[PDB]
Amino acid sequence: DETTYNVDRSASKKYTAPLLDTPKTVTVIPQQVIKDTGALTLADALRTTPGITFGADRPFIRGFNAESDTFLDGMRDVASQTREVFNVEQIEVSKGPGSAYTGAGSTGGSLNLISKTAKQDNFTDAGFTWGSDQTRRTTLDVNRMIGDNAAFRLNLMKHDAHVAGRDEVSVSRWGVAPTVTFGFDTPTRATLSYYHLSTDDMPDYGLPLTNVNRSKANPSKPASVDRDNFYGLKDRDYRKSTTDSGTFRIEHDLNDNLTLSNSTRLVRTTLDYIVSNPDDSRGNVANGYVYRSAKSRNSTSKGWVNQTDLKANFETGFIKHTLVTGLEFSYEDVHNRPYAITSGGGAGNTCNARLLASGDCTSLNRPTPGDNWTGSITDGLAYTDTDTKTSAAYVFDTLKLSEQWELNLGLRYDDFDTKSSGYQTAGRNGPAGYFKRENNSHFWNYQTGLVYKPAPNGSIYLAWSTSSNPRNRNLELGTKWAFFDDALSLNAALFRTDKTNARLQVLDGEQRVQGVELGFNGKLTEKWKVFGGYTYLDSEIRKSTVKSDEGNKMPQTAQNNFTLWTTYDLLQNFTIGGGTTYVDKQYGNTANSTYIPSYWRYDAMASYKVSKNVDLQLNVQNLTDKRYFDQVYSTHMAHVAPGRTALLGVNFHFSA
Ligand SMILES: CCCCCCCCOCCOCCOCCOCCO
Ligand SMILES: CCCCCCCCOCCOCCOCCOCCO
Ligand SMILES: CCCCCCCCOCCOCCOCCOCCO
Ligand SMILES: CCCCCCCCOCCOCCOCCOCCO
Ligand code: NA
C-alpha cells in the first residue's frame, strides 16, 4: 500500500530478487517517508538512512564518493540533472557489494532516483505550504486513467523561500513533469516522460575554515563566528540552473518468461553562477577579514543515454534462474566559459581599505551582503568543451538452488572515453594556450552473493564484488528479516571495502572502510511506524605516497551515524511524528587537518485530518535550532546547515 515505510522490491528491473533475498545492503526511501518528513530536497530525504555524507554536492556512501553512481530511473545521469522531490516516487540507496547499475569500476554504493509514473487510478493531490523561513510552496499531482490501457500524470511545483539562519540567502525553483503510459495489461508497454526544473538561488559556501598552523595536531575548523553569517553579495552572486529531460521506454513480452526493453533519454542542462568563496585561504580570516573570492560557471550540457535489456525466467535442471542482461551507451557534451571577474578595489589578495570600500572584502565577524560591489564581470577568454562516451554490458542472475539456498552472480564491463579541449589562461595547468586532453579506460566487475534462508522470511548472506582495470574489493556478511507478514524489515550487516585509488583527486595507495550497519523500517504495531538505521564506519588510509596520511581517517566519513524517524497514529484523526539524527565528526582531507564537529538534530511532525480530502501538516525541522555544518571541504570553507524551520501545509487529496 502507498503509505508503507517498508518497500519489499526495487523499482529497478535490474534486481533479480526481492530485497529480502538480495545479498547487499539496500534501503528504499519510500514516498510516504518523503511526505511525512516534509523533505523538500534530495539531501533532506537522504538523511533518513545512515552512512551518506556530501563533499566536492557529490554524495559519499560509506566513506566513498558516489557521484558517478547516481542514477535516474536506473540510467546514467548524463549532463548531471538537478532533481527535487516533487517528481520523485522513491529513492533507492544501495551500499552492499556489487551494483545493479553501470557505475564504471564501482564495487557498490549507488543512489537511484525513481521518478513518478502514471498509475491506473484517478487522483488529484494539491499542497500549499507556508514556512517560518518565508517558504511559499505549491504542488499539484494529477493522475488520470485513459481507458483500461493508458494513463497520464502531471506534476507541478513552485517554491520560494529564505534559508533559516543564513543571512540574505534565498532559493526559488519551479518544475513541470508530464508522463504518459501506453499499454497496461498488454504485451507491449511504453512510457513517455518529460521533466523540466528551473532554479534561481543565492549560492552559499558557508563559513571560512581557519588556516593558520594547519596540521593534524592543530586542525582547522570553521571560524567561531555567528552561524547566520553570509559572505556573498546580494548584488553579484547567483546560481541559475535549468534541467530538461525527455525519456522514451518501451518493453515487450516475447513470451510469459522473456521481456525485451529499450530506453532512451535526452537531456539538456544549463548552469550559470557566481558565488563567493569566503577568503579562499588568502590569509585575511586570521586578521578578521574575508575576501569575497568570486568563482563562476557558465555552462551548457547535452546528453543521451540508451539502454537495451533482456529479462528472463528459466530453468536449468532443478535450478531456477532469474536473469537480466543488457547494454548501455551514453554520450555527454559540456561547454563551459567562466566569467572574468575583476576587483573594484585594486589588485592583491590581502584586504585593505580600498577593497573593503569596493565590496570585494568584508568583516569576518559582521559581513554585510548588502554591500555595493564596484567590480566588473565579462565573458572570460578560457573555455572548455568536454565530450564523454560510455559503453557498458552486464549480466546478472539469481539462481535458486533449493528452497534454502540461492546464488547470485553478476558480470559487468564498462568503458569510458573522455575528451576535453579549449583555451586556458596562465596558471596551474601551464602557460596560456590551447589544450586537448583524452582519457580512455575500461573495467571488469564481478559479483557473487550466496544466500541462505533459515526460514521463508529470513536471509543470511555473504557477498563480494571486485573490479579490475587493465584490488578494489567489497565484502559483506549480512542478515535480513521480515516480520508481521512483511510489515517490518530488520537488517544487519558487517562489511569491509578496500580501494587502491579512491577519489576529483586520486590517491596512490590503499583505503579501507569496515564496519557495521543496522536498518529498520516498517510497522512496530498497527499505529507505530519506524524508519532508520545505524552505521559504524572504521575508515583508514592504509597506504599513501604521503607517509603522514597513513593511519588517518578518510575524509567525508563519520564514524557513527544514527537516524530514526517514527510516526504514531494517536487518534484516527491525528498523527504525530519525530526524528533524531546523530552524525559524528568529519574530516575534510586525508591529512585530517580540517574538520567539522558532530551534532544531534531533532525533528517533529503533526498531521490533522480536517476531512477525508484535506490534511493539515506541521513539520518542525531542527527543533532545537542546533547550528551545525553538513559539509566540510578539504580547504577554504564549511557549509552551514539551516537553523530551525516550521512548515505548515494544507494537503488536498481527491481520489476516484
Ligand atoms: C537569466 C539571467 C542570468 C543572469 C542572472 C544574474 C543576475 C541574477 O538575477 C538578476 C536579477 O535579480 C533580480 C532579483 O533577484 C532576487 C533573488 O536573486 C537570487 C539570485 O538570482
Ligand atoms: C528518443 C528519446 C527522447 C524522446 C522523449 C519524448 C518525451 C515526450 O514526453 C511527453 C510526455 O507526455 C506529455 C503529455 O503532454 C503534457 C503536456 O503538459 C502540459 C502542461 O500543461
Ligand atoms: C547470458 C545472457 C543471455 C541468456 C538469455 C537466456 C534467456 C532465454 O530464456 C528463454 C525463456 O524461456 C522461453 C520459454 O520457451 C517456451 C515458451 O513457453 C511459453 C511461456 O509461457
Ligand atoms: C562465463 C561468463 C559469461 C556469463 C554468461 C551467462 C550465461 C547465462 O547463464 C545461463 C545458464 O545456462 C548454462 C547451463 O547451466 C547448466 C547448469 O546445470 C548443469 C548441472 O546439472
Ligand atoms: Na536575482
XYZ file of N, CA, C and O and ligand atoms in Angstrom, residues 152 154 156 176 178-180 192-194 245-248 264-266, ligand 2:
89
model
N -2.186 9.134 -17.665
C -1.432 10.364 -17.750
C -1.194 10.833 -16.332
O -2.085 10.713 -15.513
N 0.624 14.312 -14.239
C 1.289 15.613 -14.334
C 1.657 16.087 -12.939
O 0.814 16.123 -12.048
N 3.449 19.359 -10.918
C 3.852 20.744 -10.998
C 4.313 21.182 -9.622
O 3.793 20.710 -8.619
N 7.931 21.168 -13.899
C 6.797 20.577 -14.583
C 7.224 19.222 -15.167
O 8.311 19.080 -15.687
N 5.259 16.065 -17.078
C 4.209 15.194 -17.595
C 4.724 13.811 -18.008
O 5.836 13.692 -18.555
N 3.891 12.790 -17.819
C 4.229 11.454 -18.238
C 2.985 10.706 -18.672
O 1.904 10.884 -18.123
N 3.156 9.873 -19.680
C 2.069 9.039 -20.168
C 2.576 7.616 -20.311
O 3.724 7.375 -20.698
N 6.354 7.666 -21.943
C 6.983 8.880 -22.431
C 6.949 9.854 -21.277
O 5.899 10.091 -20.717
N 8.092 10.422 -20.930
C 8.184 11.322 -19.816
C 8.951 12.577 -20.190
O 9.926 12.530 -20.957
N 8.545 13.698 -19.617
C 9.304 14.913 -19.760
C 9.492 15.516 -18.383
O 8.614 15.416 -17.522
N 14.595 17.120 -19.686
C 14.843 15.684 -19.855
C 13.655 15.055 -20.504
O 12.509 15.361 -20.147
N 13.908 14.226 -21.508
C 12.844 13.500 -22.206
C 13.211 12.034 -22.304
O 14.337 11.700 -22.699
N 12.285 11.159 -21.923
C 12.549 9.728 -21.877
C 11.466 8.908 -22.589
O 10.256 9.190 -22.465
N 11.905 7.943 -23.383
C 11.031 7.014 -24.023
C 11.479 5.607 -23.673
O 12.642 5.239 -23.896
N 15.525 5.262 -23.942
C 16.364 6.323 -24.459
C 15.997 7.602 -23.766
O 14.801 7.903 -23.600
N 17.002 8.368 -23.375
C 16.784 9.634 -22.710
C 17.710 10.682 -23.277
O 18.895 10.400 -23.533
N 17.149 11.864 -23.527
C 17.892 13.020 -23.976
C 17.796 14.079 -22.887
O 16.717 14.276 -22.308
C 14.101 9.433 -28.286
C 14.062 9.639 -26.778
C 13.587 11.030 -26.385
C 12.094 11.202 -26.658
C 11.371 11.561 -25.379
C 9.961 12.099 -25.644
C 9.309 12.516 -24.334
C 7.910 13.116 -24.538
O 7.239 13.207 -23.279
C 5.874 13.539 -23.365
C 5.273 13.318 -22.016
O 3.848 13.450 -22.058
C 3.449 14.765 -22.343
C 1.954 14.912 -22.398
O 1.727 16.293 -22.683
C 1.677 17.006 -21.463
C 1.879 18.472 -21.576
O 1.819 19.026 -20.231
C 1.489 20.412 -20.348
C 1.166 21.038 -19.000
O 0.124 21.995 -19.215
